[PDB]
Symmetry: C3
Subunit: 227 residues, 3 copies
Amino acid sequence: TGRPEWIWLALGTALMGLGTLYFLVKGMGVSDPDAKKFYAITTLVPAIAFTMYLSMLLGYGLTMVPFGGEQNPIYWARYADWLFTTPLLLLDLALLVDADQGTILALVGADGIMIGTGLVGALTKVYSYRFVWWAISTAAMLYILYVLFFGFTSKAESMRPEVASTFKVLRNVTVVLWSAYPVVWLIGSEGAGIVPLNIETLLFMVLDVSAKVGFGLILLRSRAIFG
Amino acid sequence: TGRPEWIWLALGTALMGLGTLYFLVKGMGVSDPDAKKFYAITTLVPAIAFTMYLSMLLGYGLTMVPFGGEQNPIYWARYADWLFTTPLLLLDLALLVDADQGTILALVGADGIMIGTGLVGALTKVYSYRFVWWAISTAAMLYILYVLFFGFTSKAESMRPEVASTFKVLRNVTVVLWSAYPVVWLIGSEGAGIVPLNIETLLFMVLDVSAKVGFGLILLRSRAIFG
Amino acid sequence: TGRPEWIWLALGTALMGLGTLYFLVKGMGVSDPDAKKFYAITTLVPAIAFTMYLSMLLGYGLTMVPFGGEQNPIYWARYADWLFTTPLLLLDLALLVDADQGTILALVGADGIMIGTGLVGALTKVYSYRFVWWAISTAAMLYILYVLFFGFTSKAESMRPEVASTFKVLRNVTVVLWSAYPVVWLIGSEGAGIVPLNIETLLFMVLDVSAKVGFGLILLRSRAIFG
Ligand SMILES: CC(C)CCC[C@@H](C)CCC[C@@H](C)CCC[C@@H](C)CCOC[C@@H](CO[C@@H]1O[C@H](CO)[C@@H](O)[C@H](O)[C@H]1O[C@H]1O[C@H](CO[C@@H]2O[C@H](CO)[C@H](O)[C@H](O)[C@H]2O)[C@@H](O)[C@H](O)[C@@H]1O)OCC[C@H](C)CCC[C@H](C)CCC[C@H](C)CCCC(C)C
Ligand SMILES: CC(C)CCC[C@@H](C)CCC[C@@H](C)CCC[C@@H](C)CCOC[C@@H](CO[C@@H]1O[C@H](CO)[C@@H](O)[C@H](O)[C@H]1O[C@H]1O[C@H](CO[C@@H]2O[C@H](CO)[C@H](O)[C@H](O)[C@H]2O)[C@@H](O)[C@H](O)[C@@H]1O)OCC[C@H](C)CCC[C@H](C)CCC[C@H](C)CCCC(C)C
Ligand SMILES: CC(C)CCC[C@@H](C)CCC[C@@H](C)CCC[C@@H](C)CCOC[C@@H](CO[C@@H]1O[C@H](CO)[C@@H](O)[C@H](O)[C@H]1O[C@H]1O[C@H](CO[C@@H]2O[C@H](CO)[C@H](O)[C@H](O)[C@H]2O)[C@@H](O)[C@H](O)[C@@H]1O)OCC[C@H](C)CCC[C@H](C)CCC[C@H](C)CCCC(C)C
Ligand SMILES: CC(C)CCC[C@@H](C)CCC[C@@H](C)CCC[C@@H](C)CCOC[C@@H](COP(=O)([O-])OC[C@H](O)COP(=O)([O-])O)OCC[C@H](C)CCC[C@H](C)CCC[C@H](C)CCCC(C)C
Ligand SMILES: CC(C)CCC[C@@H](C)CCC[C@@H](C)CCC[C@@H](C)CCOC[C@@H](COP(=O)([O-])OC[C@H](O)COP(=O)([O-])O)OCC[C@H](C)CCC[C@H](C)CCC[C@H](C)CCCC(C)C
Ligand SMILES: CC(C)CCC[C@@H](C)CCC[C@@H](C)CCC[C@@H](C)CCOC[C@@H](COP(=O)([O-])OC[C@H](O)COP(=O)([O-])O)OCC[C@H](C)CCC[C@H](C)CCC[C@H](C)CCCC(C)C
Ligand SMILES: *C\C=C(C)/C=C/C=C(C)/C=C/C1=C(C)CCCC1(C)C
Ligand SMILES: *C\C=C(C)/C=C/C=C(C)/C=C/C1=C(C)CCCC1(C)C
Ligand SMILES: *C\C=C(C)/C=C/C=C(C)/C=C/C1=C(C)CCCC1(C)C
């Protein structure tokens, strides 16, 4: 159930909000129309995660789903967060590496499915079926990382050294971080309960703040984002 | 509860639908690819408000939320309306003043949060917490008006006189109208019941029709929208 | 109720998934940045329909709505599908014929309403009112077909012969297919039960696979999609 993890949600909520503040109060005197963009996408990610973590802390983003043979505590807010948050992150990588609108659209449709499917997977009452949805979502995810790692890196080799290198850093970080989510989900309170909801939230809190604030920090503090 | 306000919802529904008709049957012989755009965004706002007001009149957009210590009548349809309607309005101002894609994205993310947060605020069961959400939403809103008023106006000074002036009119109107919503909400049936749901709907009906039809009229009837 | 149509949903789910696979494993060695786009939009349509059909087969996309004087089986998943699927289809026609951003935005707002209204129509408890929503949705739809048929065709006459002709084929197909949905809906289990949910699903399954996979096949297998 949901109560003892309140602390990881409260600390997650705080780091998001400050993460939003620092990024906001940093990109104010930025005139470069490109940087101005990078700040917008990057600043919006924590602003969203903030509202959603806060909803979990206040107990709104928590619902109870019956499966297996019991009433399970499912934090749906996570997906309302990820749904807009993951695409924005993808967009940061795309502008940086200057991706084709056709590939951006594909990655954005791949992503929406990943979360959409992951949300359905978290609310399905037939315990067994949840894993079917987990599969479809993890497949979609790999598609995204295959393109980010191989496809994008290729597009990064035609940009100036600052960009190619910052992209490299960002690329390694998303690929490692992203693949943690599905594992955490599979062993958490949405799949096979091998790990308590207590620790699960402590894990998703580290994985999030790193992917949202961490990632923003790496990028925003480089010159890779200028013309 | 919801019944005695049926008349403000029925008259709101009518003004929206006619508002859609007049704008539609006005921009038909428009060839200018820019005006053609302004009509599209501007015409869609009332078309949406129509469907949503109609849902309130038909009782679908009304739900009952328990808080404080009673069952409260909450018209959720408003946000399903605003969520797409406010961003479109923002887009009208942006094309007019020729804003950066980075600022448009920021204002659109600021807006989505404002309504998203406002929706959560209207459905939260812990009476006290509703105001927390009200705060976050009103903060987001001010961000939007700060940019519209100071930021955009600045971008309007480099456009031809017709545009700068029409923008001025539009700018004053949105800033005054927008700031009424949060006040109406705070004193209405979603916050502290100082005002009955009866009058509340009469207020939101004036504020809406003015912001959607009124605003469209001001703009659409000027030459500010041409090349 | 929902059980005997499981077979049309299972066969629909399969044709979607394979439809996704074939399109995916076809557009891999495509370098043309335009084709690369057409594949993205076109490939995403079946990928979405897949997830949604699967949700119906697994029973998640089915809900029970009380109206008339009974409990009715309503597959809401259809609209979660159509909402993103129809706009993508519209986008295929638009890029092909090179439409104005103002018209694309109008058709996309027209479409969102059509499904949005159609969804409301399927969940409204006042039997009679459902038809009101059906009307608004069918009106929106005609608007879309009026533009596709007359407006777009006009834009197609200034493209090379391969495009104008492929567009013609695509145009006839969408206009005939699209207009079947509202009729099927009116006589199905969402309106007047003249037809059993059994056959209704067999009809929507043919109409979908044709509109999504069929349409993609026609387009994707022509050179109309290259520069
Ligand atoms: C413009 C765009 C193009 C924007 C589109 C935005 C929109 C479509 C995003 C949707 C995102 C999705 C992923 C989230 C939905 C998940 C869905 C499955 C969950 C839905 O449930 C929550 C929903 C409704 O809340 C409820 O109100 C109903 C009506 O009154 C009730 O019937 C429900 O029951 C009620 O649910 C709540 O309460 C339940 C309580 O039950 C009780 O529990 C207590 C516990 O102590 C006790 O046991 C009681 O006895 C028992 O009864 C609880 O269980 C439920 O979980 C729930 O709390 O909420 C609406 C959420 C809102 C939509 C979130 C928005 C997210 C943020 C703000 C988005 C910011 C986005 C912008 C758009 C991004 C910009 C970037 C772009 C430019 C790219
Ligand atoms: C393409 C894009 C990128 C598009 C995305 C669009 C989408 C994500 C927008 C979502 C917008 C959000 C903000 C609205 C959701 C708010 C949410 C909290 C409220 C959800 O509830 C409503 C929902 C479901 O209705 C219900 O069906 C369920 C399943 O069958 C039931 O379990 C629910 O209970 C039921 O809820 C209804 O009935 C309740 C009745 O209870 C009873 O009351 C009576 C009273 O007399 C009596 O007491 C009974 O005894 C008692 O039981 C009632 O209380 C509930 O309130 C409710 O009526 O509805 C779906 C709504 C649909 C999604 C609205 C769409 C809006 C319009 C058409 C959008 C047009 C948008 C286009 C996309 C814009 C284009 C522009 C772009 C280009 C920028
Ligand atoms: C980034 C974008 C800009 C993306 C935005 C995406 C988002 C906004 C799309 C929304 C689309 C809309 C149209 C779908 C919503 C329809 C709505 C009316 C229906 C909502 O209900 C379903 C929802 C919640 O499920 C439920 O969880 C709640 C919380 O725990 C519960 O309170 C609910 O009751 C529960 O509902 C389920 O279970 C019910 C069961 O009742 C029982 O029935 C059994 C039967 O045997 C028995 O009788 C039991 O006794 C009885 O109690 C059942 O009746 C309900 O129907 C339901 O199953 O589900 C969330 C769905 C999720 C949002 C779908 C996503 C769709 C896909 C994956 C989208 C891919 C999109 C990308 C974004 C496209 C990319 C292209 C762009 C670039 C253009
Ligand atoms: C604890 C908190 C997390 C809780 C708060 C609630 C929160 C959840 C809601 C907040 C809304 C949030 C979504 C906003 C995100 C904004 C972010 C995406 C912005 C990124 O930034 C993008 C820029 C767009 O730039 P421009 O205005 O167009 O400048 C043009 C210039 O003239 C150069 O032109 P040239 O190119 O031709 O040379 O934002 C515009 C730049 C502006 C001109 C300057 C704005 C300054 C700010 C108003 C002040 C900084 C913020 C404050 C310290 C406090 C934050 C609270 C918030 C509510 C305002
Ligand atoms: C009471 C009502 C509110 C209830 C109704 C239900 C309602 C909720 C649903 C309605 C759908 C609604 C969302 C539609 C909004 C549309 C709006 C955004 C349109 C704005 O307008 C944008 C234009 C796009 O223009 P184009 O076609 O591409 O023209 C190109 C030309 O050749 C010049 O080219 P050049 O630049 O190279 O020189 O719409 C295309 C222009 C067309 C070519 C002309 C269209 C004419 C109309 C079909 C007729 C006018 C409407 C009718 C009187 C009745 C309205 C009912 C509605 C259902 C159709
Ligand atoms: C049964 C199934 C339906 C169930 C599966 C679950 C499913 C629901 C979820 C799947 C996700 C799905 C949404 C993905 C849709 C993708 C689709 C829209 C893609 C359309 O395609 C768009 C391209 C973008 O191209 P690029 O990478 O940018 O190439 C640039 C080149 O260098 C030329 O540059 P130049 O222009 O300058 O000359 O996708 C990128 C091209 C890549 C570089 C090549 C990718 C190859 C694929 C990874 C392998 C093909 C797929 C596999 C056989 C199996 C499919 C399973 C799926 C999970 C991966
Ligand atoms: C908030 C930032 C990031 C980096 C979020 C990423 C989220 C995912 C990669 C989620 C993936 C999932 C999978 C692959 C399996 C089903 C459940 C998840 C949605 C958690
Ligand atoms: C339909 C047109 C307009 C101009 C709608 C504007 C809506 C807002 C500015 C809503 C603001 C809110 C705040 C600031 C506080 C919480 C509740 C609201 C969503 C009503
Ligand atoms: C999946 C592909 C297509 C071509 C889907 C098209 C869907 C429609 C044209 C739906 C139209 C409806 C109307 C006009 C009436 C109310 C109910 C519907 C949503 C089925």
